[PDB]
Every structure is written in structure tokens, then in C-alpha cells.
Amino acid sequence: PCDTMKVGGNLDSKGYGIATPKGSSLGTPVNLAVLKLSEQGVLDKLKNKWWYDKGECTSALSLSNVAGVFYILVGGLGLAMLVALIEF
Amino acid sequence: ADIAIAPLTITLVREEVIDFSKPFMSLGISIMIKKGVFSFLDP
């Protein structure tokens, strides 16, 4: 529902990191896999798909900032025409 | 278990006991808080 907001900036800078137990056979290859994905740009594609794809959330003045005065003007022109025709 | 493909955050203490990889996404701590026509008369 977009009922909240982020304020200010980041207190500390860090990164999420895959983990493995000491001496794992997976540790050496996962590093190379991460670097290859980073170079290819895959991580950015996943980020865009799961973050931006879920998105549900001087300068001159614009007709919007003054439209009210235009509404009053036209309404007045109308009231005037009505008064005149009534008198006629 | 044998691996953690998770949103796990790197830190000095956890490295002393387990081996991390190169970060796959960067981040930082942050703070989360709760979020006229006749306007020409406002002045």
C-alpha cells in the first residue's frame, strides 16, 4: 500500500555476501560465479525484475495552479449573461 | 547445511567463523517512517 517512506541516507555501507563453512569446496567456485554474473550484468537484471518491476510507487506555474481563477471567470460571465437576459 | 544463498550481511564476527564471498549486492542501514482549485486565496 506504499504507507511508509525512507528518510535521510545510509548510516553505514555494506554488502550481502554468500557464505560457506570453513574449507568448503563450494567457496572457491561461488566467488568466480558471482564475479561472472556481475560482469554479465545478471544481478542487475534480477534486481530490476524484483524491485523496479514491482513498482506501484524555478519552474513556471501551470494551468493547474490557477485553474480556479479561470473557473470563476467563466462562471461569472455566465451569471452576467443570465442577469442581463432576465432583465431583458 | 553447506551454503547460504540468502540476504546475509557480511561482518567481521561471522567471517571469523565462516567464509563469505564477494558481495552480490550493496546496501546500507536506513530509516523507515510513516509517510486546491481555490488555492489562490492561500496567501
Binding site: - | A1, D2, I3, A4, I5, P7
Partner: peptide, 30 residues
């Protein structure tokens, strides 16, 4: 060879599929 993968449901990193009752194996997580 098979990897024991640990995770938590911290969206959007890990979250169950809709109607995952009919999903079997790792497919129940998206």
C-alpha cells in the same frame, strides 16, 4: 555434490508462490 541451501522468507529475496500447494520440490519458493 547436492547443496544444502539455507534461506529465510525476507521478501523479495525469498517468498512462497501463490497456490504453492500444487508446487513440489524447490519450485514452491520464488
Amino acid at each position: 555434490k547436492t547443496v544444502v541451501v539455507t534461506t529465510i522468507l525476507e521478501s523479495p529475496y525469498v517468498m512462497m508462490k501463490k497456490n504453492h500447494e500444487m508446487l513440489e520440490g524447490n519450485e514452491r519458493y520464488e
